[PDB]
Amino acid sequence: AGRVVRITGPVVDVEFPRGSVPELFNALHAEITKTLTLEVAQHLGDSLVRCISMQPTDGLVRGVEVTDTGASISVPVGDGVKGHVFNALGDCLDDEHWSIHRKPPAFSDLEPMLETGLKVVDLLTPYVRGGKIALFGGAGVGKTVLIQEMINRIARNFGGTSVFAGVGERTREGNDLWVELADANVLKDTALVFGQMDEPPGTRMRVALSALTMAEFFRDEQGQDVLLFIDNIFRFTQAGSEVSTLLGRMPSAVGYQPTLADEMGELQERITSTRGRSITSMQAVYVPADDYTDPAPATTFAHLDATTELSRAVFSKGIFPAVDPLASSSTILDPAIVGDEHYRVAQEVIRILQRYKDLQDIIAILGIDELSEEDKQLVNRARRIERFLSQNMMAAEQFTGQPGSTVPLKETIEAFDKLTKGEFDHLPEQAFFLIGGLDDLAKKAESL
Amino acid sequence: ASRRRAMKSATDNADDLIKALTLAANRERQAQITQEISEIVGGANALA
Amino acid sequence: IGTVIDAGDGIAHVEGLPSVMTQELLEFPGGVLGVALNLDEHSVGAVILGEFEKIEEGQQVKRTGEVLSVPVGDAFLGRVVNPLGQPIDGQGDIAAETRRALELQAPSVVQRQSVSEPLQTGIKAIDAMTPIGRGQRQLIIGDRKTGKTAVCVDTILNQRVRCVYVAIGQKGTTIASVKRALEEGGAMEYTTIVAAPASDAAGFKWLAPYTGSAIGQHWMYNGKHVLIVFDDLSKQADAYRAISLLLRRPPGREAFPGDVFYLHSRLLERCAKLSDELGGGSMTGLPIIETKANDISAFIPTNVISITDGQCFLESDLFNQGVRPAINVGVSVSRVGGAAQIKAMKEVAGSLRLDLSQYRELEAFAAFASDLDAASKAQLDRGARLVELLKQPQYSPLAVEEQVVAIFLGTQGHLDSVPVEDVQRFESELLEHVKASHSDIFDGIRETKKLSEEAEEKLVSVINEFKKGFXXXXXXXXXXX
Amino acid sequence: EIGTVIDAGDGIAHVEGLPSVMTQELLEFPGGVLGVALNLDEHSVGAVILGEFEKIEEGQQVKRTGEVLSVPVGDAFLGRVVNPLGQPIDGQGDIAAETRRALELQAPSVVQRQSVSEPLQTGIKAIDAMTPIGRGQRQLIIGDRKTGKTAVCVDTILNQRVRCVYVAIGQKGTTIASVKRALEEGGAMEYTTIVAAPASDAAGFKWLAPYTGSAIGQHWMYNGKHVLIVFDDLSKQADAYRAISLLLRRPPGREAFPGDVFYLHSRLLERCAKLSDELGGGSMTGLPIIETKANDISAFIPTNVISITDGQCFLESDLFNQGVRPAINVGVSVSRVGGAAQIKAMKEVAGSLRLDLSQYRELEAFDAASKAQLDRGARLVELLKQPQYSPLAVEEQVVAIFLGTQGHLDSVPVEDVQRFESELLEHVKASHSDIFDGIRETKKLSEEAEEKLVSVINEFKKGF
């Protein structure tokens, strides 16, 4: 047992008897005049322990008893976590417990393509097993619809579960997500962790660890490819800066914490593929001042494999998913990892779409007439390629009407091969709209 | 035909100019923040 | 009992008070109040909520045994009060037994419902493009003299929903002029005015938003709808910065404390739309932030932007150029969107945003007249006229049925024949005509919340007839071709 | 002697006792975690922790080792993966080596050096030709993320099949594993030591990682053997030192860095040198890396390292995306040693190669004479392009450059230059091995060999 000495915002100093001082990052409970969870930070001296509060420190008094758990903040793990809602501390918000803090595996021991089923992703921006994907999109474009899809597909096909982490989320959006998952009936194969903007910086710091720890057990023990959805990862780094200042650390470049790369490094490295199985992290990343040179987004980009840029222009056309094929990229798109054929087709598709985009300005004024015979055909193919990239989503039954379709890698490669060569020049533009396999193209072609 | 060429290059040059200034702006933006804070924290450490 | 050791700059260190609570109300011996923030090893750092001129070393301070609380009720409606809840207007005392704590936890994840109830500001630009729902948080951000307060006042006038205008770091004469504006419109009767002016200490400015929120929460939990306005959080942030620096808390970015984001977070989150189980009341927020040289990238703006559910960025260049309100369409967003719009507005202003996005892209070409094709020329002529409809005079909120008709006119291309400069007068005279003669069309939109095929054909005939009557101000007149 | 911890936090620890403790002495906490005594105060000892400090508390007992910061060295480290301290992470037994070296050691003096006149072949056409690297030289590899900085270093190590020392600082584990895997495939791991201080590790490890890798290399250097060290990268090691300094409450300067951030990189890189004949005549080549932000060479940390190193190889994003891989900007990139670090064969053929391509890029931006230069230049670019993990021998490079420069590819289309190069080398490898053998031995192209090549090319063109 200890006694509270000093309180200054979310920082609390506690006295303990000489040689019974709690270890660092250990959870300490204290009764409010509710139970407040404090986490140890520094050893001031004379058996004084400076701690960071995980909830508001309003109602505390000097001399109040503080109990030592003798371990870091524990959170629930297993199949019971699925279809539930938790906080950073690991308490049920819908009315074994392992520590959140742990080092990642050694790099020598870590094993050195994640088939989604979507044509646009697999071809142009293929995801990685144990890799880090970034979901760029405007306001109300199609982030949640896509995350629900990735849950649905990998849960159904591969059988692996998912874990969502609302790191400084809007509480309103959390309520919207809950109902969205409830209607789709994908709550059962999804775990939810929430540490919204309302809570102090202490929560937003550790909330990411709690959700990650749960995912790590699904990875290690169950032996399955688990999904980790983080929104937003920047807010962890932001929270890191907030606590850093109050702890009394001198700020670094652009007023960030000096241990920015370290804090991020410890989190991101845990999100990795082991020999047994992998964890695929679909992260959202804020870019302050639209400045990619800013330390926060600059450091994050080092950890990441893939990017998916959703554009409003493609959304306005009615192309779902509205992935920007040019802007979006993936590191693993090389002839070594994925073979020469895939690389050849992928780049050739990009070439056609790029030239189409260049001619938009000329077509806007003059039109198709002024273009050459070759360009006329390229524009025709480009438009058909744009519409073929559209696909039915399993999650989007309420939206579209028709059920979703999953397209293997071999089907994807062969399809775009035939399109580039110009074997489907006779078919209409409507035939390519919202279809999976090549059989469904030909079937819809006859009806029209 | 000559205007097309002339104004095309001008537009390409403008694109390049924007990129150079935008970097210079962000350089200054980050620097000004870093510089102000160091002076503020410097004064704080002076007392205690 | 405790004794003051140090005093100055609205701060006081107190000896004693061994079992004092955090954020507890203390009373100095002159009757001035204080707040125990920092409970140190051998002292208690207290911020003074009042004049500290007769607070000295040796003076005796006592405990109240209460965390900050403020009275609430229907009595506050049409009254002007300070953070503590004392009336300044001078219209008797506030008869209300019910009280609420300033610091209260916001509704949980389960204790909320999705926002699907429009809160009509009465401003065409906002309602159409960036709609605000009941329980939503919409930031109003921009430079000085861009029309931030004007939008909030016009919103309050259009509710003629309980209103709570919180003034932080404002000059007295401004708050008086705002009160005068509400009296003229006749919107003061359902409006509470919390005021923490510049003369007041930092403590008042720091508290001002929390007090205004607490007043609104009383209605929220009872199952009634509220609108709160913070004018502005920029000054409240500056006030907290002052307090923290005086208490010797370590500064961060822009000399602000670590929990400057946390300050705004707890405040804004309390604004929400409750579940059906808890009545189903709401509490809409309109926070304000004062940018410097249109710097959105700044620390405090970015903090509030990341909290709120969309932003309405006002620009100086647009305001001066004649676009009033000066809402930048591209940057401004509504996170709720169509959910906080009636079906009538959703249909007409569905592809208004798309047309104007194309217009701004084209705009460059407009100067070079008749050097383009036909399609682009029509878009420019259409776009230019749409801008004139979005323009709106100060202190003139329009009803939702009047807005839908005005937008329907422009979007369908009924103003294409009329000159651009005469669009504003055409709109005004048209609404007057429909108000008088064709009230059934307005009534239909009010009830059904949609524009019927009958109403469409009715409007077309009404427009055509009016065009013939309408005398064009500039040059000759033109009806149709 | 024994001491007790008074204060602890943020990877720093104040210790009571240890009265006769040395400066920069290795201390051992009671959990087995190590530390370094930096600040010896009046009534305390400021120590930086080289490990996790989660189970380091007030009252815990710390002991002296009686040794100033030092790491074991030898032949045992070859084909092993170790941390800064020198503990194996790969899990392939312990490191049997009695010989040790201090981390902080003075670099060779002015008199204890010899001018660099020994080529270190990277096996990359662009580098070897334009910006050559000699034994003892320091060549900076600088550019944005995903420009191919690491790739160049790995290809260099593969081409040595000279002892290699790949130092990884602030790297993800999976990357270091993939680098190790690449060395195993090529079969270059046997003569390669891998020092690894990944992102998870504390700032201390990142700060130390380069100094440990340098110390390992110095053992070979002083014995009169040649070494190549690779820092990947110093940008993160700088950031690590910034963190430490700010935690210790040292006053920040430009870009929130301490005053001795330049001094940090200076002592490290200078230790890389070419010793005199009196001291064996061993070498220790350096390939430091810096990560620029939006191709900002003007930034503080880049400018610091640029001013230290003996030339730079600036990689560009625009060039990389456009297809030029490696994406070395010819105009900006330089070699300070130059022709001295080139064999006579390469010196002759690639004497005015960098100048011609500098003129090409100028002309590209915008006659008969100018048209020919553009057609020539465009084809030269295709030769400079090189696939990943494919180092070419020096004799193969000189022939490929000789082909382009003299204008043997002018008749052939630009797109078919890459295949022409591959098939040509296969022909010469099979039939005319004597030409390659001549260049290997003599290190020069004879007038006979020139006329031989011309006839071989002409005959092949007909067949092609």
Ligand SMILES: Nc1ncnc2c1ncn2[C@@H]1O[C@H](COP(=O)(O)OP(=O)(O)O)[C@@H](O)[C@H]1O
């Ligand atoms: N839509 C409008 N049309 C015409 N004038 C306006 C409009 N909105 C505001 N104004 C005028 O411009 C001024 C803007 O100042 P103010 O409301 O103080 O902006 P801020 O609150 O952002 O400083 C007001 O005094 C008002 O008279």
Ligand SMILES: Nc1ncnc2c1ncn2[C@@H]1O[C@H](COP(=O)(O)OP(=O)(O)O)[C@@H](O)[C@H]1O
């Ligand atoms: N010579 C080359 N040719 C083609 N691609 C290359 C070459 N060198 C590197 N790359 C590509 O660049 C990517 C990143 O290389 P890397 O050396 O890790 O860059 P960085 O060091 O900037 O991260 C790899 O995925 C690889 O495919």
Ligand SMILES: [Mg+2]
């Ligand atoms: Mg105002």
Ligand SMILES: [Mg+2]
């Ligand atoms: Mg690299």
